[PDB]
Design a protein around this nucleic acid. Structure first.
Ligand code: MG
Ligand code: MG
Ligand code: MG
Ligand code: MG
Ligand code: MG
Ligand code: MG
Ligand code: MG
Ligand code: MG
Ligand code: MG
Ligand code: MG
Ligand code: MG
Ligand code: MG
Ligand code: MG
Ligand code: MG
Ligand code: MG
Ligand code: MG
Ligand code: MG
Ligand code: MG
Ligand code: MG
Ligand code: MG
Ligand code: MG
Ligand code: MG
Ligand code: MG
Ligand code: MG
Ligand code: MG
Ligand code: MG
Ligand code: MG
Ligand code: MG
Ligand code: MG
Ligand code: MG
Ligand code: MG
Ligand code: MG
Ligand code: MG
Lengths: 222, 127, 51, 159, 58, 172, 185
RNA sequence: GGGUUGAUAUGAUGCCCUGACGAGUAGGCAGGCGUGGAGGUCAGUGACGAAGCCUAGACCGUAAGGUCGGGUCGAACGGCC
RNA sequence: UUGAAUGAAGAGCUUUUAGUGGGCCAUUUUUGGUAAGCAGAACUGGCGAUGCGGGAUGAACCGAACGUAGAGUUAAGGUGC
RNA sequence: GUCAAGGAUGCUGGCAUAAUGGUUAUAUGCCGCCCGUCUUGAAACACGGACCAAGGAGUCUAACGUCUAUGCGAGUGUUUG
C-alpha cells in the first residue's frame, strides 16, 4: 500500500542517515589512530633528540588465547579461565589490563598465550571471527544494525565503533567486550614455532606473555 | 517420477550386526548393545565394530524414502490403494505378502489406472 | 544463512564500514609520513654504543 | 589414642605474645559493642572464661547479642557442602572491632561528601574505586643521570 | 582385613558439585539467643510503636 | 636464536616520592627478541641490585647493530657457566664478523664442549681484541698467520638423485 | 573439548504443558498460549503457567478467601480469577456480589456466588471479557496447608510431624520425645 | 530462546526460525521395537493358499525391528486405538 | 560510576529415590621402615567409569576427552628404512 | 535498472545399463587378544562356557510414603448388604 511505501522510503532515509553517521565516525577514528601513532613516534624522536628516553605508556589491553586443553587443570586456574571465558582450547578474549586482571593472568600463565593486540589484528578478529551475544544465542555480527541494537545505548553503532572501544579501552569496554563472544580461533596456520608448546615464550615454548608477538600468532590462527 | 528430493545420503549402509554373531550360532545378528564390563565393543576400541547411535540418523527430508523417491505404503486391497490417489508422487503402493494372486491383479490394474506406483508388481504372477 | 567474510568480499566490507571506499580511494594505508629531520643526542648515541 | 579435646592443638595459639603477658589493658573493657558491629576474634589465653573455640580464632563475625561482659557473634562455618550460622557467646577480651569496617564507613562518609560537593557543582564525580591502572607515558631525563651499569659478575668464592 | 582407614580425597570435589552454599541472610533475624531482658522490652516497644502509628494514621 | 640480537636495556627502579629520578641501570643483552631481552635484564638486575620487575620499569630497549658487520674480528669472551658440579669462569676466543655471531658461536661451543645450556651461561664480556699478539688461544692464532691459505681435501658433492652413473670423485 | 561450567542439555524444570489428557484444558491452554504470545499482558502468561499446575499446586480457593480478597481497598469490583477450583465456605455468612472466573466451581460455591447476585465464569469467558486481564485479581490457595507438607523436612528440632499411622500414647511419645525417657528430640 | 489463528492451514503432543551442546561404569529417567491373550475397529488377509520354516535376493529404520520377492507348506492370521 | 575487577552458563527453593560406603595411581609435602610394584596421611589431577593420537608394548605418563561425515590446521611425538 | 549484496548457476558431452551404486565372496594396506563376571586392576597362567533348540530369573498380595491423572469437594468412599 501507499502507507507501506511511505514506511519503506522512511526506512531508507533513516538508513542513509545512519550510514553517514558511521562513515564520519570511522573517518574520525582513522584520524585519531593516525595522529596517536605519529605522536608516539615523534615523542620517541623528540626524547632521543633531547637526550632523554620516552617511556611508552604501559599497555592497557591484552589479547589472551587459551592454548591448553580441557583435562588436568587445577581448580584455581580452571576457575580463572572460566571467568576469562576461555573454556576451550584456542579461545581468545580481550582483557583490560589492571592489577585485578594481571593477577588472573599470572594464575593462568601456563595455559594461555597472551600479548598486546594491535589495531590490525583487532580489526581482523572482529571482522572475521566477530560474533555477538544476543539472548545469549551467539549472533554473527555481519551488519551494523545488530551492534546498534545491543551496544547502541553505549554509543556503539557499528563494528568499527566496537573495534574502537576495544583498541582504545573506553568507558564501555566491559560491555563491548562482554557483548563479544569469545573468539573461536583455529590452530595456527604455520604451526606454533616452538617444538614444544608448554614452556614459557622466554624459554622457547608458547605460553605466557608474548608482548607484541601475539599478533603474528593470532593472525596465523585467524 | 516422484517429487524432487535431495540426493539420498545413508551415512552407514552396512548392517549393524551384533558382536560375536559371526562366532556363535546361538548369538543372532540382531543388534544387542554389549553391556559387559570389559567389552571392547562397548569401550569402543579401534578395530572393533561400530555401534548404532543417533549421529547415523538419516536426513529428515530424505528419510523413509525408497531410491525411487517414494515412501512405501503397504496395500492390502483397492480401498487401501485409493488412499494414495492424490499422493502418487510421494507414496508408492506395495501389495502385502498375503494377498492372493487374483486380488493382486485388480490391485495392480487399479493402481495403473490411478497412476500409483507399485514396488512389487511381480508377486504371484502366473508365467 | 551463511557468514560472508569481510577481509574478502568487498561487498560485505562495504556493507559494514562505509569508510572502506574512502580508505581505498585515498590509499590511506600506504600514506607517506612527513620527512622530519630530528637528530638524536650525543648522550643517547654514546650510551647506545657504549661498552 | 587420639586426643580431640576443646583446646587440643592450641599450644602456640592461645600463647600470650612475648613481653605482652599479664593484665588486660582497660581499653578492651572500655570499647563499646553494638548489635551489627563486625568484630575479629582473637582469644586472650589469660582470660579463660568465655573463650572461643580454636576454630573461631581469626574468624570475623557480626555481633547479634550484647550481654553483661560478653557479646554474641555470628560466624559462618563451612560444614560439609554448606555454611552454618554459629552463634558465639564470647567475653570482650577475645573480641576487637574490625578495622576493615572502620575504613569502610570512612569511605561511605567520603563518598557522601564527594557526591554532595559534585551536587554543589554540576559535574559528575565517578566515586568508585579503581584498580592499579597501567602507567602512563614518561620522559625520563638523563641530566645528572647518565645510564651507567656494567655486566654480570664472575664467580668468586669468598668462603 | 587391612584396608584404607580414612581419606579426604574426593570430598572437596563432592562438596563443590552442588556448590558451597552461604546461609541466605534475611532482614529481621530470629531473636533466638538475644538477651531476654532486651526481648521483653522490644516486644513492648514494637507494640507501642505500632499502636502510635495506627493512632497517627487511622 | 637463529642469530642473536644485542639490545641495550635501560631500567630504572620506579620513582618514589623520597627519590624521584632514580639511577637508570643499563645492560647489553644477547637475546632472540625483546621479550627475552627484558627478561634477562631483570634476571641480572635481580642479581646486582634490590629491584625486581614489580618495583622497577624498563625505560628503553634498543637493538645495537654491529658497527662494522663485514670486518673479521677476534673476540675475547669472558663467560661464567654452571657445570654439573659447580660454577666456573671461562675465557674463550671467537673469530667472527659480529658480536652476535660470536655469541652464537659461543653458545654452540659451550653446549657442545661443556654441555652447558642457555640457562647455565652468563656472558660476562665480549670485547674485540684490537691487536694481534694479545690473541691468546691457538685455535684462533692459526688464522692470523701471514698469507694464510689452506685447501679443502675430500670434497663431498650432494647429489639430488638416488642413483649415480659415474663413481664420483672427491677432488677439489 | 569444552570446559563446561553448567550441565549440558538441562531441561528448564518447568511444565510446558499440562500432564492431563483433559481436552477442554488443552483447549484453554491453546487459547491462553495465543493470548500469552500475542497480547503482551503479564496476566495471560501467569494464567497460562498456572493452567499447567498439578492438583497439589492448584489448591482450592474458598469463597471466604474470595470475599476477603474483595475486602481489599478498591478491589471490590475486580474479577477474581482462580486458576483451579473454587470451594464453598459455610463459615462466612455474607458473600458480596462479584464476578469469579475459575476452572471449576463446586455446587455449593456456585450456589453461594449466584445467590448473592454474582456470576461464575470460565477462563474463556474471562478471555473474551478481559483479554489483557484488565481489572482482575488472581487468587491462589494455600500450598503449605497440605497434610503432606507437615512431614517434610523431618529431623531433630525441626518440629515437623512424624510419618505415623496410629497416633496416641505408645505411638512415638517416649525416648526421644521427653527429658524423662532419654532425651528431647 | 522464539515465530506462527479474524481459511495459521485445518497435523498448534503441528510447521518453522535462531543459538549452543553431544564421552561414560553403577544408577536414574525418557522415547520407542518385539511376544502371548482381551475390548474396539479396517464391512482387514486367506484353500485363486493363513501361520510356520528356508533364502551370501530387494527396500525402510541410527537401532530394537518392519516390509517385500522366490521356495517349501497346508488352515488360519494381521494393521491401527 | 549506587559506591573494586572479571564472569554469570538463568537465580532461589522443595520433594522423592537409585547406586555407593573394598579403591588405586601420579607430581609436590610427609610418617613407620634399610628399601620396595610396602604400609599410612595432606592438597590436587587422574584411572576406576575412558575411547583417541604418542610413550614399540602397559588402567593411571604426555597430548587431548569422543554424535555422523568432508576439507583445512595442529598438539604430544616424530621425519634413514 | 544491474550486481559477486540474507547459501550455484550457466554451457556441453557420454551412457541410459550393471556403467554408477547396493549386497556378497575374495584379495591387498593398516588396525583388531574371548566373551560374561568379581575386582584397584582380566587377554590372563582367575572363574562359567563343547555345540544347538525349547524352557529360564524384581512377581503377586496386605498396609503404606512421595509424585502424578481423575471425580467430588468440608466433605468424601455405590459394590458388607
Ligand atoms: Mg602446511
Ligand atoms: Mg540398513
Ligand atoms: Mg542393522
Ligand atoms: Mg540377538
Ligand atoms: Mg574395566
Ligand atoms: Mg549456520
Ligand atoms: Mg593432639
Ligand atoms: Mg601467637
Ligand atoms: Mg551420553
Ligand atoms: Mg495378541
Ligand atoms: Mg476375503
Ligand atoms: Mg504362505
Ligand atoms: Mg543362512
Ligand atoms: Mg488340514
Ligand atoms: Mg505378529
Ligand atoms: Mg557402610
Ligand atoms: Mg572402607
Ligand atoms: Mg620416614
Ligand atoms: Mg574402562
Ligand atoms: Mg592410549
Ligand atoms: Mg607421545
Ligand atoms: Mg617404552
Ligand atoms: Mg620410538
Ligand atoms: Mg604436565
Ligand atoms: Mg583430518
Ligand atoms: Mg538395470
Ligand atoms: Mg563399483
Ligand atoms: Mg595388529
Ligand atoms: Mg569396581
Ligand atoms: Mg574379561
Ligand atoms: Mg570349563
Ligand atoms: Mg553348560
Ligand atoms: Mg528361549
Amino acid at each position: 500500500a501507499e502507507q507501506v511505501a511511505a514506511e519503506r522510503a522512511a526506512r531508507k532515509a533513516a538508513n542513509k542517515e545512519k550510514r553517514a553517521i558511521i562513515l564520519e565516525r570511522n573517518a574520525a577514528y582513522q584520524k585519531e589512530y593516525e595522529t596517536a601513532e605519529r605522536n608516539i613516534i615523534q615523542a620517541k624522536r623528540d626524547a632521543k633528540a633531547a637526550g632523554s628516553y620516552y617511556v611508552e605508556a604501559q599497555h592497557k589491553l591484552v589479547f589472551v588465547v587459551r592454548i591448553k586443553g580441557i583435562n588436568k587443570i587445577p581448580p584455581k586456574p580452571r576457575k580463572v579461565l572460566q571467568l576469562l571465558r576461555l573454556t576451550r582450547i584456542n579461545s581468545g578474549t580481550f582483557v583490560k589490563v589492571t592489577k585485578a586482571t594481571l593477577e588472573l593472568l599470572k594464575l593462568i600463565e601456563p595455559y594461555v598465550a597472551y600479548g598486546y593486540p594491535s589495531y590490525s589484528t583487532i580489526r581482523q578478529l572482529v571482522y572475521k571471527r566477530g560474533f555477538g551475544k544476543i539472548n545469549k544465542q551467539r549472533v554473527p555480527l555481519s551488519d551494523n544494525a545488530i551492534i546498534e541494537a545491543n551496544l547502541g545505548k553505549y554509543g556503539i553503532l557499528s563494528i568499527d565503533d566496537l573495534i574502537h572501544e576495544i583498541i582504545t579501552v573506553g568507558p564501555h569496554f566491559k560491555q563491548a567486550n562482554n557483548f563479544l563472544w569469545p573468539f573461536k580461533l583455529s590452530n595456527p596456520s604455520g604451526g606454533w614455532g616452538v617444538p614444544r608448546k608448554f614452556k614459557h615464550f622466554i624459554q622457547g615454548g608458547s605460553f605466557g606473555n608474548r608482548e607484541e608477538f601475539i599478533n603474528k600468532l593470532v593472525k596465523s590462527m585467524n | 517420477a516422484s517429487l524432487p528430493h535431495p540426493k539420498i545420503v545413508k551415512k552407514h549402509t552396512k548392517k549393524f550386526k551384533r558382536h560375536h554373531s559371526d562366532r556363535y550360532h546361538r548369538v543372532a545378528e540382531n543388534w544387542r548393545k554389549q553391556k559387559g564390563i570389559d567389552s571392547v565393543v562397548r569401550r569402543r576400541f579401534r578395530g572393533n565394530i561400530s555401534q548404532p547411535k543417533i549421529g547415523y540418523g538419516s536426513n529428515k527430508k530424505t528419510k523413509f524414502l525408497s531410491p525411487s523417491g517414494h515412501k512405501t505404503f503397504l496395500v492390502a486391497n483397492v480401498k487401501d490403494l485409493e488412499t494414495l490417489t492424490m499422493h502418487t508422487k510421494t507414496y508408492a503402493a506395495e501389495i502385502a505378502h498375503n494377498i492372493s494372486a487374483k486380488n493382486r491383479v485388480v490391485i495392480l490394474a487399479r493402481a495403473k489406472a490411478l497412476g500409483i506406483k507399485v514396488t512389487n508388481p511381480k508377486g504371484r504372477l502366473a508365467l | 544463512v551463511l557468514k560472508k567474510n569481510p577481509l574478502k568480499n568487498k561487498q560485505v566490507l562495504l556493507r559494514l564500514n562505509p569508510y572502506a571506499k574512502v580508505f581505498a580511494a585515498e590509499k590511506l594505508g600506504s600514506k607517506k609520513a612527513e620527512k622530519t629531520g630530528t637528530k638524536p643526542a650525543a648522550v643517547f648515541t654514546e650510551t647506545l654504543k657504549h661498552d | 589414642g587420639k586426643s580431640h579435646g576443646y583446646r587440643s592443638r592450641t599450644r602456640y595459639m592461645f600463647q600470650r605474645d612475648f613481653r605482652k603477658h599479664g593484665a588486660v589493658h582497660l581499653s578492651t573493657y572500655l570499647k563499646v559493642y553494638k548489635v551489627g558491629d563486625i568484630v575479629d576474634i582473637k582469644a586472650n589465653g589469660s582470660i579463660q572464661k568465655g573463650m572461643p573455640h580454636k576454630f573461631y580464632q581469626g574468624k570475623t563475625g557480626v555481633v547479634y547479642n550484647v550481654t553483661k561482659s560478653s557479646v554474641g557473634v555470628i560466624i559462618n562455618k563451612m560444614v560439609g557442602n554448606r555454611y552454618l550460622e554459629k552463634r558465639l557467646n564470647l567475653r570482650v577480651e577475645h573480641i576487637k572491632h574490625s578495622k576493615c569496617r572502620q575504613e569502610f564507613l570512612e569511605r561511605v562518609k567520603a563518598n557522601a561528601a564527594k557526591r554532595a560537593e559534585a551536587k554543589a557543582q554540576g559535574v559528575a564525580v565517578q566515586l568508585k574505586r579503581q584498580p592499579a591502572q597501567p602507567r602512563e607515558s614518561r620522559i625520563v631525563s638523563t641530566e645528572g643521570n647518565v645510564p651507567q651499569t656494567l655486566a654480570p659478575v664472575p664467580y668468586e668464592t669468598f668462603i | 582385613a587391612k584396608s584404607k582407614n580414612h581419606t579426604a580425597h574426593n570430598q572437596t570435589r563432592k562438596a563443590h558439585r552442588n556448590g558451597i552454599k552461604k546461609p541466605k541472610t534475611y532482614k529481621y533475624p530470629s531473636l533466638k539467643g538475644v538477651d531476654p531482658k532486651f526481648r521483653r522490652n522490644h516486644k513492648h516497644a514494637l507494640h507501642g510503636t505500632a499502636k502510635a502509628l495506627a493512632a497517627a494514621k487511622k | 636464536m637463529a642469530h642473536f640480537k644485542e639490545y641495550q636495556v635501560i631500567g630504572r627502579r620506579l620513582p618514589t616520592e623520597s627519590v624521584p629520578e632514580p639511577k637508570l641501570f643499563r645492560m647489553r643483552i644477547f637475546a632472540s627478541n625483546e621479550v627475552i631481552a627484558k627478561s634477562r635484564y631483570w634476571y641480572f638486575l635481580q642479581k646486582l641490585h634490590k629491584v625486581k620487575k614489580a618495583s622497577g620499569e624498563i625505560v628503553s630497549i634498543n637493538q645495537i647493530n654491529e658497527a662494522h658487520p663485514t670486518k673479521v674480528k677476534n673476540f675475547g669472551v669472558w663467560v661464567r657457566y654452571d657445570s654439573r658440579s659447580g660454577t666456573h669462569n671461562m675465557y674463550k676466543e671467537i673469530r667472527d664478523v659480529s658480536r652476535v655471531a660470536a655469541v652464537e658461536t659461543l653458545y654452540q661451543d659451550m653446549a657442545a664442549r661443556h654441555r652447558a645450556r642457555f640457562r647455565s651461561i652468563h656472558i660476562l664480556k665480549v670485547a674485540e681484541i684490537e691487536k694481534t699478539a694479545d690473541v691468546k688461544r691457538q685455535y684462533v692464532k692459526q688464522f692470523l698467520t701471514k698469507d694464510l691459505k689452506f685447501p679443502l681435501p675430500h670434497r663431498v658433492q650432494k647429489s639430488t638423485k638416488t642413483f649415480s652413473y659415474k663413481r664420483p670423485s672427491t677432488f677439489y | 573439548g569444552i570446559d563446561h561450567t553448567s550441565k549440558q542439555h538441562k531441561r528448564s524444570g518447568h511444565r510446558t504443558a499440562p500432564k492431563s489428557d483433559n481436552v477442554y484444558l488443552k483447549l484453554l491452554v491453546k487459547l491462553y498460549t495465543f493470548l500469552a504470545r500475542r497480547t503482551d499482558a503479564p496476566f495471560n502468561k501467569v494464567v497460562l503457567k498456572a493452567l499447567f499446575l498439578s492438583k497439589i499446586n492448584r489448591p482450592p480457593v474458598s469463597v471466604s478467601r474470595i470475599a476477603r480478597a474483595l475486602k481489599q481497598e478498591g478491589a471490590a469490583n475486580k474479577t477474581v480469577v482462580v486458576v483451579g477450583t473454587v470451594t464453598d465456605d459455610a463459615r462466612i455468612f455474607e458473600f458480596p456480589k462479584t464476578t469469579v472466573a475459575a476452572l471449576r466451581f463446586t455446587a455449593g460455591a456456585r450456589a453461594k456466588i449466584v445467590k448473592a447476585g454474582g456470576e461464575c465464569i470460565t477462563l474463556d469467558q474471562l478471555a473474551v471479557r478481559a483479554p489483557k486481564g484488565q481489572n482482575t485479581l488472581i487468587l491462589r490457595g494455600p500450598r503449605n496447608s497440605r497434610e503432606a507438607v507437615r512431614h517434610f523436612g523431618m529431623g531433630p528440632h525441626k518440629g515437623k510431624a512424624p510419618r505415623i499411622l496410629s497416633t496416641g500414647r505408645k505411638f512415638e511419645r517416649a525416648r526421644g520425645r521427653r527429658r524423662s525417657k532419654g532425651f528431647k528430640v
